Design a protein around this nucleic acid. Structure first.
Ligand SMILES: [K+]
Ligand SMILES: [K+]
Ligand SMILES: [K+]
Ligand SMILES: [K+]
Ligand SMILES: [K+]
Ligand SMILES: [K+]
Ligand SMILES: [K+]
Ligand SMILES: [K+]
Ligand SMILES: [K+]
Ligand SMILES: [Mg+2]
Ligand SMILES: [Mg+2]
Ligand SMILES: [Mg+2]
Ligand SMILES: [Mg+2]
Ligand SMILES: [Mg+2]
Ligand SMILES: [Mg+2]
Ligand SMILES: [Mg+2]
Ligand SMILES: [Mg+2]
Ligand SMILES: [Mg+2]
Ligand SMILES: [Mg+2]
Ligand SMILES: [Mg+2]
Ligand SMILES: [Mg+2]
Ligand SMILES: [Mg+2]
Ligand SMILES: [Mg+2]
Ligand SMILES: [Mg+2]
Ligand SMILES: [Mg+2]
Ligand SMILES: [Mg+2]
Ligand SMILES: [Mg+2]
Ligand SMILES: [Mg+2]
Ligand SMILES: [Mg+2]
Ligand SMILES: [Mg+2]
Ligand SMILES: [Mg+2]
Ligand SMILES: [Mg+2]
Ligand SMILES: [Mg+2]
Ligand SMILES: [Mg+2]
Ligand SMILES: [Mg+2]
Ligand SMILES: [Mg+2]
Ligand SMILES: [Mg+2]
Ligand SMILES: [Mg+2]
Ligand SMILES: [Mg+2]
Ligand SMILES: [Mg+2]
Ligand SMILES: [Mg+2]
Ligand SMILES: [Mg+2]
Ligand SMILES: [Mg+2]
Ligand SMILES: [Mg+2]
Ligand SMILES: [Mg+2]
Ligand SMILES: [Mg+2]
Ligand SMILES: [Mg+2]
Ligand SMILES: [Mg+2]
Length: 142
RNA sequence: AAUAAAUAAGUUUAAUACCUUUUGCAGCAUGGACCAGCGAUUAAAUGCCGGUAAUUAGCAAAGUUAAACUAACGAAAAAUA
RNA sequence: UCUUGUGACUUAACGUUAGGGGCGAUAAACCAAUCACGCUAUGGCAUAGCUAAGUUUCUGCGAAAUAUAUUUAGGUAUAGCUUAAAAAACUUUAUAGAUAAAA
RNA sequence: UAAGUCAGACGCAAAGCUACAAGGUUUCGCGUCAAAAGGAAAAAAGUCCGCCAGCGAGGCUAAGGUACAUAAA
RNA sequence: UACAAAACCACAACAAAAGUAGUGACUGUUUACCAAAAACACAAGACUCUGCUAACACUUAUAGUGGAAGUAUAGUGUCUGAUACCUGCCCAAAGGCAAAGCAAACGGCAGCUGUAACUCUAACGGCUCUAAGGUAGCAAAAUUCCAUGGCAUUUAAAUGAUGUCCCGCAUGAAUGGUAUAACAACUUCUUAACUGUCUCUAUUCUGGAUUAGGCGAACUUUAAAUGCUUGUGCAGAUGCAGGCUAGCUAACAAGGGACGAAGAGACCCUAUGCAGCUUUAGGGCAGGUUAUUAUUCAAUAAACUACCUUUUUUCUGGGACGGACGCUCUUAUUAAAGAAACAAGAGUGAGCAAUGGUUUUUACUAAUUAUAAAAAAGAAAAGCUUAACUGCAAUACAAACAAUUAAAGCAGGGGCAUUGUCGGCAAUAAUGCAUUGAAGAAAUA
RNA sequence: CGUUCUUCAACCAACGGAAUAAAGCUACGCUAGGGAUAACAGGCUUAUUCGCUCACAGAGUUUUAUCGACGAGCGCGGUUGGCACCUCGAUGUUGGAUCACCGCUUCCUGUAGCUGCAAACGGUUAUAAGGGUUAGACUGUUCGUCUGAUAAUGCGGUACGUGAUCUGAGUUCAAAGCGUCGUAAGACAGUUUGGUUUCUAUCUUUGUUAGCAUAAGUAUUACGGCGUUGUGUACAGUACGAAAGGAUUGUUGCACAAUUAAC
RNA sequence: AAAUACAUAGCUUAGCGGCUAAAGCACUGGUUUCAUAAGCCAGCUAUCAACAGUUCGAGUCUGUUUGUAUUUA
RNA sequence: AAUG
C-alpha cells in the first residue's frame, strides 16, 4: 500500500581546496561517474577515499573515443611529489590525534581500563576470551 | 460581569465573570446557592549528583574492625671557565 | 370494563430445600422494594496507561506538538528543542606577455 | 535538563491525493498564534503596524487617517 | 354439540351480536413493576436404556437416603403434542454411540443438452457427478428480493379481504405434512344495529382551579439592574459591532426562546477492562464410565461425559468487510542532501565449483527487474589455480540506540604473474537480536 | 560437571522477534472515558442537482409562433455526495392533529405585448404575492393510483416549523414464530403478533386586567393595527363565423358561497 | 463497484511447458434387412474466448479488453 | 426377431 526504501546519500563530501586526511570518504556514488586520480582509492561499490594528507581537486579529461572522464585528486601540502612526503604524512597523523584529545578533554576516555587484562594472540591484542582466567606471572615452572 | 478613569457633578468615555479542558471557549462545553470548620509528594532504608564542614571513620583504650592508597620509560645540565 | 368462579382451585398455622447452591407448567423467572449469581464481615487503603482535584508572596530564565521503536497509536523510551568582535578557515569556479636602467 | 513536550492551527507561496473543491487531507519554505497585552480594518486567536518593570494633564512617530458621528487640510 | 330463523311471549329490578381467514385441539400456566400470546404445560404417539444390591439422583462416601418396598403391561431420559388421513431416499467423509450396526439419534436430499404437422412446449433421448440427489401434499404463505405478480368477487373509487393460477430468491413430511366440530379478554376482514367518533358543537350538574381567613412543602440557584433585528464568533447571541427601542411593579392566562429542569448517553468508538454463555481454540485430571495391572474402599491414563484454568494484534479520512506490514530500483515536490499519504510505476525472500582469483591473444563492445557505468576497461577463447583465507587495523560515511556501509596498512600461509594484483561475484535487493538446543576442537576440575 | 573458541538449526514473514501454547457470542449485559470519533440537526464546499445568458445547429418550413442541441460562462443552496468545525456530567425519530411567519421560480382570481390569434378553447413572454388553494376509497406512511365536485386544487424556507400543546400506526430494548446462514452460543442489514410518552413558569416573548405615578372632559393632526373576496346568471344566441360554435365591456343589475362583525 | 472460480471440433468431456491433442454422442461412407431402426466396419472435423508479454518453445505461466456463474454493498 |  505504501512503504519506502531507506535513503542513500549520493553525492560529493568536499569541494576544491578542502583539506583531507587518509581514509576520508570524498564521494558516494552508485556508478563510476567519477574516476580515481592521484593519491586516492576506490572501493568495490565505487566509494572514493583519500590516501594521503592534502587538498581535494577536480578535473575533466577528454578520451580517445570522444568520451568525457572526471577525476578526483588529492594534492600534497606544498606541491611536494617527492617520495619523502610519506614520512611527513605519518607524523601529521600522529599529531592530529593529539590535537583532538586535547580539545575533547580528559573525561572523554579513548582507551578502556578494566580490572583484568585482555588476552594476547599472535602478538596483538584480542577481544576474545580464553577458557580460563589467570593472573599473569603468578606461577612457576612445574 | 454592576465596575474603572475622570468631571463645571448636569454627565462623558473605556469595558462580553472565574475555574477546568482545548488548534481555538463570553461560551449554546465542564464545576460551584452562601458562610464557618475539616481536606491532598509525608516517613524509613539504600543509591546517584551539588552545597557546608571535619582532615580518615567506628569501637575499644599501646589493638582491633571499615574504607582508601600501592611502578609508570629514573627523560633535567640553565658553569661570561 | 373485562376473565375465572367444585378445581391442575383459594385460604390460615407451622415445617423442609441456601449461593461452586436452591426452586422453576422456561419468563433467565423467583430466592426480604428488581438476581446472566443474595446479604454481611474479612483479604483490602483490591487494581485503574482513564476523569476530577492539588492551599502564601516576590525576582530571574524559558519549550514542544517532529523523527525512530514499541500488544504501540489519547501510554512510554531515545534523539531533537529550551538551560548550561576568540582561534582556525578563504567558496558558487577558467588565464596572460604592459619592463629598456649603457658611449 | 535522568525536566517538560511527542492531539497542533491559519496566512502568503509550491507539489501529491480530491473535482487545478472544502475552515479537507499529506509533505515542504517563511511568518504569526499557541505562550502576546497595545494601535488600524465594525465585532476581529493565525491578516497589517508593533513586543507591556512602575507612575506623570510633557514631546516625536508607525500602520492607517485629515467636512458629521470622530482627533487632524 | 354449535349456528341461522318470519313470528310469538315480557309487572318493578338485572342486561349486549354474527360471519370469513390465520394460529393453537380443549380447561389450565407465565416475564411481582411497560409483553397473557401463536410461547409453556397438557391427554396421546414413538425411540432408547434398566433383571433388582435395577438404571439414575443427593453425598467426602467406606455410610445413609430417594427410585420403591415398586419389579419390564414397571421405572429413568429424549423429541413430537387431542383426534382423522399420511409419514418417501441416504450411515459415504468428519464425529458420537453400538452386537462391525443406528436417521421418530445430531444431519443431507444436483447440473448441462437435443427433440411432436404452423408455432410453442417436451411425452421421449445424450452426458457429467454424488452417500443420496426432495416423493406425496401444500404453495404469492406468520415463508416471495422483482411486487402494489395475473384473473374473478367485494366499493362511486381497493398497496385491503376471500377464491384461483405456480420449481417455491430460500416449501416439504414426528425440529412432522395436510385437514378438522367445539373452544379463545389472541391477530385479520365483513354484515346488522347503534350512537357527540365525526360534519360542528352548544347548554348544564358535581369536584378542583379561581376569591378570602388559617396552616405550610419540593425540583432549582457562579453573580445579575436579564428588549428586537442583521452582522460577527468554538461555525444557531439577553450580555460583542451597526440599525432600532423611553411611564413604574405586579395579578390572571398561554407555552416560542433561556442550545429550560431531572439521571458523569443506553446508540457509536476507545480500555492494563469486567462478567455470563458456546465450541472439533491451548493446557490439566480432581467425580463417574471405560481400559490395563496389583492386594484380600487400590495405582497409572493422548478416550467419552462433568469440572477447573488460560488465549482470542495493530494500522484505518469512525468501526466492521477488504487490503497491508521485511528489503531494493524509478516518478512529482527542479539542477546540494533530506522529505509524507490505504499516492504512482516495476522487482525480490536467489543463482554460480565457475558466472570466483590471476596471466596471454583480438576482424568483438553486449546484457540485466530497471538504468547515458566502464577502452588500459569489459566480454569471449586458451592455460594454471582456491584469497569464496588465519590473527589484527588508522580514518570516515551514516545513524535515537541496536545493528548496517567503505577501508589504507601490519604479520603468517598461499595463487597467477615476475614485482603487480587476489580478504568472492560491474554497482544499487536475495534477510532475523537475545534466549534455548546441537556439532568439531581445546583448557580446567 | 563446568568454561572458551570454530559453527549451525527451529518458531519468530504481526519480519526490534519473547507471559511456552492457544477461537467465538451478548438484543440479558455492567464499569471507566471521548464530541480527540460515527448515526439526526446546524456549519464549510458545490462535483452532482436546479436555474439563467451566450450559442440558432437541427425540427417546424419564409419567420427565434412553438419545440430544441453540441459547447462555454455565471448564479442558487431545496437533490445525491465530501469533510469531521459545535454538542456524548443527554441538541427527544418518521408522518399527522392544532396554530403559524416569510420568499416568488404564479395553480386560480389581475395588467400589457406576440402568435401558425376569425369566434370559443389555447400557446408563449414581461409584470403582479391582497384573497383563495376541495370532500372521500387503498396505504403507518412523505409519495403514489383512483372516484364525485371545483375559479383553481402552486412550489419552497422556517432544528427537512411546531411532543415543558396532543397523538405513537412505522422505525429503534427485554417475549415468541417462520425462512436463510453458523458445529454451537447466536446473526439478518428479511418478515409477523405484543410492548410505560414526566415537569406547580424565576427571566425573556405574547393575550388580558388592576394599582401607582401631572385635575377632568371634547379632541384636528400624526402614529400603529386590519386589508377592500369568489362563483353563477341577465343585458345577447348579439359581435365573429359558410355552417357549426359562440364572446368582449361594466365605480353594471340580481341570487348564492366563504370570511369578518355583531345580534 | 469489491471477492472467488470458468471460457476447450457440431455438443458433453482429456490436457495445465518438449511440438498443437485423448474418450464418448453427432456427421459421412460401407455391411446386415423386402425396407426402416438396433448391431458391426472404416473415416472426418489445422480441436484449444481475444490482445499484449515471459521463455530456446506456452492450450498450459503473468496482465488488459470482453462474456458466465458465486459471495458481498 | 422393435416397426410397417
Ligand atoms: K449570601
Ligand atoms: K374453567
Ligand atoms: K428432533
Ligand atoms: K386469548
Ligand atoms: K416557555
Ligand atoms: K470522514
Ligand atoms: K509486531
Ligand atoms: K451527543
Ligand atoms: K398569476
Ligand atoms: Mg509488498
Ligand atoms: Mg474540539
Ligand atoms: Mg451546577
Ligand atoms: Mg431470552
Ligand atoms: Mg525572556
Ligand atoms: Mg512484539
Ligand atoms: Mg504518540
Ligand atoms: Mg502526533
Ligand atoms: Mg486543516
Ligand atoms: Mg496547549
Ligand atoms: Mg506630529
Ligand atoms: Mg474634529
Ligand atoms: Mg390455547
Ligand atoms: Mg383460557
Ligand atoms: Mg410485566
Ligand atoms: Mg389468557
Ligand atoms: Mg399486561
Ligand atoms: Mg396425535
Ligand atoms: Mg421447518
Ligand atoms: Mg405442530
Ligand atoms: Mg376552591
Ligand atoms: Mg447571530
Ligand atoms: Mg442583541
Ligand atoms: Mg459519559
Ligand atoms: Mg483498531
Ligand atoms: Mg552507533
Ligand atoms: Mg605477491
Ligand atoms: Mg574483488
Ligand atoms: Mg456508561
Ligand atoms: Mg470534532
Ligand atoms: Mg484534522
Ligand atoms: Mg415574478
Ligand atoms: Mg413545508
Ligand atoms: Mg421537523
Ligand atoms: Mg428476543
Ligand atoms: Mg428458526
Ligand atoms: Mg443447520
Ligand atoms: Mg394486548
Ligand atoms: Mg413408432
Amino acid at each position: 500500500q505504501g512503504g519506502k526504501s531507506h535513503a542513500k546519500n549520493w553525492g560529493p563530501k568536499f569541494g576544491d581546496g578542502e583539506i583531507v586526511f587518509p581514509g576520508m570518504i570524498i564521494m558516494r556514488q552508485k556508478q563510476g561517474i567519477y574516476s580515481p586520480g592521484y593519491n586516492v582509492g576506490r572501493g568495490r561499490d565505487y566509494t572514493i577515499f583519500a590516501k594521503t594528507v592534502g587538498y581535494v581537486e577536480y578535473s575533466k579529461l577528454k578520451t580517445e573515443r570522444g568520451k568525457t572522464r572526471r577525476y578526483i585528486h588529492v594534492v600534497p601540502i606544498n606541491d611536494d611529489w617527492s617520495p619523502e612526503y610519506q614520512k611527513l604524512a605519518d607524523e601529521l597523523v600522529v599529531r592530529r590525534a593529539e590535537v583532538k584529545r586535547q580539545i575533547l578533554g580528559h573525561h572523554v576516555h579513548t582507551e578502556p581500563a578494566f580490572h583484568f587484562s585482555l588476552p594476547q594472540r599472535n602478538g596483538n591484542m584480542s577481544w576474545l576470551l580464553n577458557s580460563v582466567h589467570k593472573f599473569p606471572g603468578t606461577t612457576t615452572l612445574a
